[PDB]
Design a protein around this ligand. Structure first.
Ligand SMILES: [Cl-]
Ligand SMILES: [Cl-]
Ligand SMILES: [Cl-]
Ligand SMILES: [Cl-]
Ligand SMILES: [Cl-]
Ligand SMILES: [Cl-]
Ligand SMILES: [Cl-]
Ligand SMILES: [Cl-]
Lengths: 305, 305
């Protein structure tokens, strides 16, 4: 029993974290086989921050301008190349702690673990979701850039996120490990701002199923709804559309608990129209949207209480 | 910016987790140097569960009755001894991944990271607090027993918790790594139940300071209070007493933000008397009590926004 914001065990990633310095700028890198991946903004200076031309800034660098340190071991850079918004630093040594890994891009509403790092040294691990507006509500301070987000399946690390910047509302933007940004954000100082966000409806339903699995039914009701009628109420409360595929993804949780997905939608509609009236669900006074259906199945018993 | 339930990086602990089997019972062990620590209830059978005499059950065992597996390597048990509610299995091999470690017992209201494990294999990492009633609101399924809780200071793992059982309300009880239970709980099937719990007042204030550091002031007010008058309101809402030492521990956060501790107590009093009125703090609709003053300083900038 119980239900927590649970991250994947971080060890396989901790063994990949290194420090990257270019002049006076230090941030984190990811050392996999003989390549170190880091944010290309490591080559920006205070003057280059409003309108850097990275192609122009990088052609002016040499291998020896990059200092890479794995703990107290310097790694010699023997090549460099720009990969969209990531730099690939080829080093003379393959990382012997390289896990089985993949580079996967995630969808808005999917979750991942973040290993927050400073000067190549892991500080903490937490769970995050990719918001519908392609930001993440991370926890990151100056120097966290190059920290990565990941999921683990068996022994294989799926890297999905590299941290690049903080937006003015204090939420975070970054790239996949091929250096392609999530969302309309760029790695320079601009007027960029997170657009309007919405609530991840399929996740809120997953989390209501978690609550039922965990033996709490208070918010359930005798009503059902159509998908179209649910979406009409959803839209009104700034919730993402729920799709038939979302209904099918909630199938297994629906089968475990015996609560039809559209009956759980009727429950959610009532919670949106009435609020919780001083009650909690799984220890929250808000409708939680950063647990996926997979997260709930991963964490909860395969037997309902 | 941002504020998450942040665990310590788990790798140093993952390299210590092993599987322990005695007959048909399998749970997790902690392999440090040449000792494996696990819950003594691994020696209980279905018949021995209401009234086991563990001294009586253990004298009937031999070294060879214990099967210990570190991944796919069997560890040979060359000695065994009971340490309060933990078994110490001496093995023929020192764990080469043993980190620098200590066994520390924590106080009610202190936080720690949990590495939830099944069959010696880490599943996830989350943050927990020791509740005032000496339970933890964990996330644990059948077979999680022997999972450990820890804090990390520099390179040194302070183990503080080993998981032993789930109570009827779905909260969790266990021991320190010397096998001494937190709280009035025992490792057998009895009528035991978590007693009444309270809110960890010093933590709620810490978390209000976190909110201010993170640039949110909405809940602040022009009032102050005495410690005695605050405690009179606290008691009424099932909050722990706030002590002068708690005031002194909140000193550095008070100095960073320029908000006197008793002025933050006046803020908390108002939040207890009025509620939040549909507003949130750091993304919660409840007063969060599982962040310590240390957790806030560890996570938040040393510069207020
Ligand atoms: Cl949590
Ligand atoms: Cl060197
Ligand atoms: Cl923004
Ligand atoms: Cl909500
Ligand atoms: Cl969180
Ligand atoms: Cl073997
Ligand atoms: Cl209980
Ligand atoms: Cl509250």
């Amino acid at each position: 029993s119980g239900f927590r914001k649970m991250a994947f065990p971080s060890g396989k990633v901790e063994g990949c974290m290194v420090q990257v310095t270019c002049g006076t700028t230090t941030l984190n890198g990811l050392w996999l086989d003989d390549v170190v991946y880091c944010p290309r903004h490591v080559i920006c200076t205070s003057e280059d921050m409003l309108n850097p031309n990275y192609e122009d800034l990088l052609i002016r660098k040499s291998n020896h301008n990059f200092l890479v340190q794995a703990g107290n071991v310097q790694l010699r850079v023997i090549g460099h190349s720009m990969q969209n918004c990531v730099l690939k630093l080829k080093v003379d040594t393959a990382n012997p702690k390289t896990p089985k890994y993949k580079f996967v891009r995630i969808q808005p509403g999917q979750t991942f673990s973040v290993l927050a790092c400073y000067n190549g040294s892991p500080s903490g691990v937490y769970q995050c979701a990719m918001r519908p507006n392609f930001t993440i509500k991370g926890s990151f301070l100056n120097g966290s850039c190059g920290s990565v987000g990941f999921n683990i399946d068996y022994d294989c690390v799926s890297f999905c996120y590299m941290h690049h910047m903080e937006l003015p509302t204090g939420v975070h933007a970054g790239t996949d490990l091929e250096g392609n940004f999530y969302g309309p954000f760029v790695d320079r100082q601009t007027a960029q701002a997170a657009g309007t966000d919405t609530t991840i409806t399929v996740n809120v339903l997953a989390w209501l199923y978690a609550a039922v699995i965990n033996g709490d039914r208070w918010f359930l009701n005798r009503f059902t709804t159509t998908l179209n009628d649910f979406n009409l109420v959803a839209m009104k409360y700034n919730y993402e559309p729920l799709t038939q595929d979302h209904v099918d993804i909630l199938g297994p949780l629906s089968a475990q608990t015996g609560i039809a997905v559209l009956d759980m939608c009727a429950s959610l509609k009532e919670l949106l129209q009435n609020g919780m009236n001083g009650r909690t669900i799984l220890g929250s006074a808000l409708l939680e949207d950063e647990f996926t259906p997979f997260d709930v199945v991963r964490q909860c018993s395969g037997v309902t209480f």
